[model samples]
Target: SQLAHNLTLSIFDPVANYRAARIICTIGPSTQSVEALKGLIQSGMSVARMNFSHGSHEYHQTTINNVRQAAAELGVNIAIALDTKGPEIRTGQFVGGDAVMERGATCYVTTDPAFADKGTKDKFYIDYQNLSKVVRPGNYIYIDDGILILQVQSHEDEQTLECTVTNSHTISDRRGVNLPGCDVDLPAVSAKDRVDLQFGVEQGVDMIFASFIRSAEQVGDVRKALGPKGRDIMIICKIENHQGVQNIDSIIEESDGIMVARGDLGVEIPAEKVVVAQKILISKCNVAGKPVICATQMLESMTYNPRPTRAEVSDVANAVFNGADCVMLSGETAKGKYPNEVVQYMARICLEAQSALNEYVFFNSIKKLQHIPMSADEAVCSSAVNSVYETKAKAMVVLSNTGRSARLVAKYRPNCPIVCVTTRLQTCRQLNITQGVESVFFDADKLGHDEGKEHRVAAGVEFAKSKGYVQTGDYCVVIANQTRILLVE
Candidate 1:
């Protein structure tokens, strides 16, 4: 009878399907319904992304409400992400929705509104009104995600560039345009973005993915815009341009986290270089102890098909192996025909890769690479992870009021589960993105220091035991504002 009771408790544990690496899914038409959102969470969607590039505030508000309701019903914490539309440029109008630019043909690029008329083979208007001031003769400008290239032969006027097309492709209106290696001055957050950002803050979103982030200054600007109320909201700087890659170190230092946005990044740099950049950014974030996400076009085929190709499988697996804290889904879940199927497949890949992780080698490598007069938090994290490595620690019990300590411990890539006890519900939800972390709410402050730590730690042990990760005699390292190694019994 006692054994049956134990089995029943184990079966009831909500986290029996725990996988260390987290998954982020963008919410859109195909998956935003309350029922669909619940299915996504059940399928292991830890973060819900709202792309500001599309949809109105009213539309996104409904999605946000549905996400909260769905997570509530399932009793899971899902972090909300508001992805901003940074200062990005695009082409003006085109006839028949697009026009073909032949290779070696002469063309003119202008900032003047007069040229905004339906785009022709000979000329087109670009959104960057100061194009002539930023670009000069012999410089290359790319359009249509780099499918069309132009070499500036001379300046037609202060508002225009007379150029020769280097490559041929059909260009559509509103297609993205990029100027590689040029100093194009644009607002860090555009006017439209300011409105969208205000909406996101008002909705109490947890994270902001500032797109096309090129410098630490821009990252600081976004935080300043969010004002004091957003002090705790995470700013995840998206490294999607050549300038971003070149200034990676400072960006990593200033931002709360990083995202390897491979789509536009590949356009600005070579595809081969983008691969190296992804690895470099992930390693840097790993060493810095900040979370990083790898995103874009992962499982693209699954948007239409029921299953992903072998190459798509390898791509997601490689991102996990390379040490990304999370891998993101864009159109795949947002508008895919097989949204639930795609998420299920991604979860399986993450589990397999996580199982193959060499925790000792990985943690030791990060330990050696970091230059530290490590902080109290960092030192505690290092010790917690190392202790687990040496002993039969069943889990790491983290007492966190702000969730920062829990996130810090997760950065070390622990082998055991991290049971995070927090005083705030929002902190509990935000910790969902951190790998190997599970949160429990306890008002540790109200209970007084000595009694609080004791009570919360006891509850933590019970929580772990119920999940079948530890027993009465098992060892665990308890981390509060400070960490203490403990014997569970």
Candidate 2:
């Protein structure tokens, strides 16, 4: 049938489960049930994100329940993520609905309580008290997430400002305001974010998508917010602004993964520049072996339609070609009517693009990577990848501690699967979120402990044979490190 063909195609030359780019989808009203979640996973969503920006605790708890139940029954590892809503300055309450402003209008935008008396502008309610200091004459003040635009005029007082309009659009009450060059001091994690993180941790979320991380310190802040309880949870940075791009290298160094958060990036910077930034950040993260996710508005308009536009498909391919670990769908899978079709389509495009992914690892690229002293975890893992290349055998077995070693080896972004063996029951469960990994957890002997490194190498040959990673007498790669508790094959 066409559906079966499409499902299989999503995995290969034109199908799902291809060897390149993994898929991440946000779970929402449309995909909140077990059946819907199962369809998404079977179709190709490797990671499921629960957004903290919307929905209540009860809603997300049920959503998480559906995802876990779906994964367990399907025998698939579906990585679950809790995405934080970081801090920013928001407006005060509005008198009512949207207000309209005319051009050349001198609207008194104030933060003073006095303006609360009869404060009314022709088209907009200027709410920020620091608007006078933040918006200098000639600076552009974007209102309503930049839907409405205003130019700052001369300051009338310490708190009030006179501004001219450059664009005409209705301004709703309490709209978000962005002053690109201005530095706003806000907590990295909002109060609601703290509650959400706690909720997600209780639900056993696999990863944390730390939003609006402007610097490496913000990544640290996220770790703290998750607290000692959630230390093992992966932190994937959401690159949402110029500050993030400016600090990209440090940010990647501190964080476990990177998400090219296109929404805020597009909102804060020129749209043309977002593409350039995405390429630059993706390449940078790849060399370091950190997971890079292409997110926001991908296949955006396809949620309501059965098919995506040509440009949407190209966008997915470009992300894969650039070496993104994951291409994510936000609105498309969360609320869109055609969630499964979109995931199926994206999987198709990725696999199709993978067919042509020049099988080049660019070992030379490794020489240029800024060295981060390998944690004992990373060292054991990298040595395993190196061992595989050296032995010229089939494949190496990676015994993962928290699956970190396994993921780290894959981070070298190898041309082979890191056959990860985990002792912790949850570790294998978590590996599904990462790209190009197959996980197994077995008893002590199943770990191949009695065998020496050389015999262990041969045992890996056997595992590869069973998995079809290699045929008899064929070369396969294998990896393992000293500190790990078990030798995997």
Candidate 3:
């Protein structure tokens, strides 16, 4: 009975106010204006993602301007992400915009440029010119996120393949095509993707969510495309195919972070196995100390409804429970009718999931994974987190100029929130993807660092107090070049 009482009290600790996992909301037509952006930030949008799969430069420019303005008006640092549309294959437009296919019917998929616009029920144009050479009979082709399927039967000509419709479905204009298990000869970055990447650099985007990364070399290609001006922008590769999954370790090592882009990944691989891939990717990133995001259709039904389905709720919670630093919403906050409501619901779910975690167990497991010879910074960060548990500190204060020390501290999975005070505003924006880190921007030049690190630590403590992260008589672990435990006065 005493143990139960103690557990109940711990569950309702004052530290419950903080939400560790971050929410990334895609900005679209529905939530692009300044006012709508303000609503999203107020409702708990930590990062605004602009999907380059659609929309013009003008459209995204407005969205970017609106996000900055809204964040400035709200007095918060919200990160902006540019999601690149990587190389993809698609079926060209139909004669009347769409065609209905019946099951067990023969269809001719052509690579001829002449058939690009004259698609019919019996014949259609696929954009990949070497589709016949890459795929053979017994291969399956998926369209519209696997809503439509075709099985290759034979090659009709050098540029055409005969296929049997496996399922009857409407084939729409310019729909995406997926060929599972095929070594597609597509470039990692397309011409349009290069242009988009350049635009993001010119616009000073905080991060880039690179889509359909299949290899470590592809990640390097993306980095090259970012060029010298965009070197600081974070590159988070989106793993959306079987190749990417198989080569995940190298991808994680090459990129800044990883995103489990399940929408296309589900089509590229079996839907049932997507869950396995998600867990593996998240765990690997966790072990490697890189931020990983679980994305795509987290709350699909909430796109229109004011509330989410039970399954969707569990999906969000499970992403957090699986150790993902961030969970993302695509259409739910992009073109969804309940953008603000969906964000609020996601935020609530993350907080609930975080509260149920066994912090002591998690910290020990992560600590045990580290190599024996730890660097000075690593040892200090680990000691700081260790002090939190030993002293029952209410919060941890970290002064990070580049956000590295803060992220290192977070990798240990401390129970309390990490109040990261940084001099660079970009550092504050970049930490949005890191779990449990709440960044505070400090202008050290304006305050003149005559007292060295003391002023920054005091600023962090004052901020924690103002935000109710700590109170009088609370203890905090302060991490600068070294570690110290402080008592709130």
Candidate 4:
């Protein structure tokens, strides 16, 4: 019992505030300081999302340094995620920084990137050169995240279209533009994104969130850009529109992981459909055994207030209830006045939601994954989950060489913690995204897989026992190509 306490002191020391779901907080002006970063880590920030949509490389570089140093000092693994801008069409510069459109006014949307603004509200610029190719007469166009709307009246030319403003709203420079239900063919990577992605690779971030991903080919484009570094760093595709939802299966197969980007998705699809999309996406990723992160406006009210709206609280709890591995904050942390309080509240919410989770409901959701055929590894992990469910097993111990087994196990949605022992540090860091998986380093090659498996099993039991996850004679399942149910002695 004394030895158990010692091992657990190290394992559960920082992670004493346990929560099943992970939190990704965007680093911005409010939380870029060293002290702020450390406080965030201590408050349960797992992944630090660096938004490439704004900020200069020099500015972001400093935050990256601050995050790494602060995490190192706190003795925790904080993953850095570089989010790419991807391909987006935005309104060009407006006169006086914005233009007000009257409801039912005639307007022109041009594909010319170099169109000069003449202080007129009747016409604007859209960066996508394929505007006419995608939108036809009578199609609806959403501007500024769908706050403003337009209906195409006619095509003026190959590069221009005339439209009627459907609503009265002010449009600012670089405001997002979207064509609902249209498959706008565009390059997945923009010129700015190319530069931003290169900077991410140079910084050696743990992951890259590719925004506006529509198809599998687009996912491959990012992977090609990653080149050799693609092997180590993860590429997470953000599903943001109708095209992405239509091509979900292929895109999920191509990318390392997926994020349910509700902002642009809400802009492009009917608002009522967004929640259904989130559940579908999260479930798809879970059954396929890939990590999924639910993002955007999770706690939007926290941007201005220390407390979250009751609706926002329910939204996040539903994501966890749907079995998402992670939930994220955007402006709530980035540029929000109360970044630390937002994270603390999110962590507490995740802990409470996880505690009240219906085990059979979560298990059946993963078990009922529609398209995927159960693989052998998945079957084993499912068996491991069932063992924990059936017998009051304190935890599941896995000896993973590449962390694949652990990921598979995580997808099955275990009721207990998973202790993943790996020889590779990269695997350890990568597994940071997986739910219910905690990784520790152990050399498998030198010790041999089976030999290492048995060795780590004993080590894991001791670690779990010390952390109060198990008692003196509780059964804990161990998997290493075969199952070994160990009774703690």
Error of 3 at 484 (Å): 1.5
lDDT tens readout by residue for model 4, 226-296: 77765678989999999999999999999889999988788877767999999899988877789999998
User: Residue by residue across 402-450, what tens digits does model 1's lDDT show?
Assistant: 8888888887877889998877878887786677888887764676555
Candidate 2 on 92-119: residue-level lDDT in tens?
Answer: 4444554666676666567676444343
For every candidate in turn, the CA RMSD to the true structure comes to: 6.0, 5.8, 2.8, 6.0
Q: Is candidate 2 or candidate 3 better by lDDT?
A: 3
Instruction: Spell out the clash pairs found in candidate 1.
Output: none
- Model 3 backbone overlap count: 0
By summed lDDT, the worst window of 10 consecutive residues in model 1 runs over 4-13
Cand. 2 Cα-lDDT: 0.73
If the candidates were sorted by their lDDT against the true structure, best first, what order would they fall in? 3, 1, 4, 2
Q: Using Cα atoms with residue i matched to residue i, what is each candidate's TM-score against the true structure?
A: 0.92, 0.86, 0.93, 0.90
CA lDDT of each candidate?
0.85, 0.73, 0.90, 0.83
Could you tell me which residue pairs clash in candidate 4?
4-466
User: Comparing candidate 1 with candidate 3, which one achieves the higher TM-score?
Assistant: 3
Instruction: Please give the RMSD of candidate 1 to the true structure.
Output: 6.0
Compute the lDDT of residue 231 as modeled in candidate 4: 61
Best of the two (3, 4) by lDDT: 3
